[PDB]
């Protein structure tokens, strides 16, 4: 025939000549997940970014996510590709909020959120994600635990163990869980009656309380089998992704509008790119990497 290949084809082509691995967050735009090799939450990202075979990784996901492919595999080559694919959530939490907040409580383990900064990180005795926060801090030794950056999350951690959150930084929050709010779960209620909610715990707590679950993106797909119909209150791309792996079932978006805008930094056309040029490579200073990962492993050690 005429035609030659698409991007599709030439992404296909570069990945086995890179010998690459295309790893993917459940909020990237449906022609990305369709073209990746494997798609989670954070916690799964990180799982399985310890059993990479490739020799190259290209995250389809934001910076701090391809920092913690890049902290588990400091000698293979991870790929962010574009340096504008960031988190709003973890650009909030500085070190200097952590070093105060171990000046207040130095018996407090710190925990981070993995949706934080290599340099955070570096910090932290042991890193969490949304399925794993509660089990993590249960499991401490201590009453008291050192938590951020969303403070949404670490409402319902609080809630969920009984512990004393110290919460850095004071404010910290995802805009796009923002957006949900009591009159969402009203409409939905009403157009989807026979529904069931799934609500990220990054939804404010008035709305956190109106769940039937509360879970991370891979805790809802985990979970999903427990009805047939579903409201989703998260980034609206998790749609796509659970009437993918559920064809039988009904999911609708609590809001249309709930959108992630350094997730969809990313581009079917710039992932061709990153293959194409080795772009954009991804590098966290050993200091930095060494303290991260031993955060970051502790983590996996703590949740299977
Ligand atoms: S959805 Fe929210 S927490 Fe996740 S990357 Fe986007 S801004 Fe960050
Ligand atoms: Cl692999
Ligand atoms: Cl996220
Ligand atoms: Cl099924
Ligand atoms: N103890």
């Given at each position: 025939?005429?035609f030659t290949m698409?991007l599709?084809?030439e992404?296909?082509?570069?990945?086995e000549?890179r010998?690459?691995?295309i790893?993917?967050?459940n909020?990237?735009?449906?022609?990305?997940?369709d073209i990746?090799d494997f798609?989670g939450?954070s916690l799964?990202?990180?799982?399985?970014?310890?059993?990479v075979?490739?020799?190259?990784?290209?995250?389809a996901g934001?910076?701090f996510?391809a920092?913690?492919?890049?902290?588990?595999?400091?000698?293979?080559?991870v790929?962010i590709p574009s340096?504008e694919?960031?988190?709003?959530?973890?650009?909030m939490?500085?070190v200097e909020?952590?070093?105060?907040?171990?000046?207040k409580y130095?018996n407090?383990?710190?925990?981070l959120?993995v949706?934080?900064?290599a340099e955070?990180?570096?910090?932290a005795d042991?890193t969490?994600?949304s399925?794993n926060?509660?089990?993590?801090?249960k499991?401490?030794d201590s009453d008291?635990?050192?938590?951020?950056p969303?403070?949404?999350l670490?409402?319902?951690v609080?809630?969920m163990?009984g512990?004393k959150?110290?919460?850095?930084?004071?404010?910290?929050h995802?805009y796009?869980?923002?957006?949900?709010?009591?009159d969402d779960?009203?409409?939905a209620?009403?157009?989807?009656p026979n529904a069931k909610?799934?609500?990220?715990?990054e939804c404010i707590?008035?709305?956190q309380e109106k769940a039937?679950?509360?879970a991370?993106?891979?805790?809802?797909?985990?979970r999903?089998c427990?009805?047939?119909?579903?409201?989703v209150?998260?980034?609206?791309?998790?749609?796509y992704?659970?009437?993918?792996?559920?064809p039988?079932?009904?999911?609708?978006?609590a809001?249309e509008?709930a959108?992630?805008?350094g997730?969809?930094?990313?581009?079917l056309?710039?992932?061709?790119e990153?293959l194409?040029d080795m772009?954009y490579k991804?590098?966290?200073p050993?200091e930095?990497?060494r303290?991260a990962?031993?955060a970051?492993?502790?983590?996996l050690?703590?949740?299977?």
């Amino acid at each position: 025939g005429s035609f030659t290949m698409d991007l599709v084809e030439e992404i296909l082509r570069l990945k086995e000549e890179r010998n690459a691995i295309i790893l993917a967050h459940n909020y990237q735009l449906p022609e990305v997940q369709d073209i990746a090799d494997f798609i989670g939450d954070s916690l799964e990202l990180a799982r399985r970014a310890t059993r990479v075979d490739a020799d190259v990784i290209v995250f389809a996901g934001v910076d701090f996510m391809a920092e913690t492919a890049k902290i588990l595999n400091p000698d293979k080559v991870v790929l962010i590709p574009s340096r504008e694919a960031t988190c709003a959530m973890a650009n909030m939490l500085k070190v200097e909020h952590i070093l105060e907040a171990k000046r207040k409580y130095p018996n407090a383990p710190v925990v981070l959120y993995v949706n934080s900064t290599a340099e955070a990180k570096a910090y932290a005795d042991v890193t969490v994600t949304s399925a794993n926060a509660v089990e993590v801090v249960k499991k401490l030794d201590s009453d008291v635990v050192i938590f951020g950056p969303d403070k949404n999350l670490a409402h319902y951690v609080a809630k969920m163990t009984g512990k004393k959150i110290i919460p850095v930084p004071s404010k910290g929050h995802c805009y796009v869980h923002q957006k949900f709010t009591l009159d969402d779960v009203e409409r939905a209620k009403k157009l989807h009656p026979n529904a069931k909610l799934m609500i990220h715990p990054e939804c404010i707590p008035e709305v956190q309380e109106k769940a039937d679950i509360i879970a991370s993106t891979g805790g809802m797909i985990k979970r999903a089998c427990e009805w047939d119909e579903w409201v989703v209150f998260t980034e609206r791309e998790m749609v796509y992704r659970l009437r993918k792996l559920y064809p039988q079932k009904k999911f609708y978006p609590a809001r249309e509008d709930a959108f992630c805008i350094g997730m969809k930094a990313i581009t079917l056309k710039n992932i061709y790119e990153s293959l194409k040029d080795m772009k954009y490579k991804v590098e966290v200073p050993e200091e930095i990497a060494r303290k991260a990962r031993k955060a970051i492993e502790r983590m996996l050690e703590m949740s299977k």
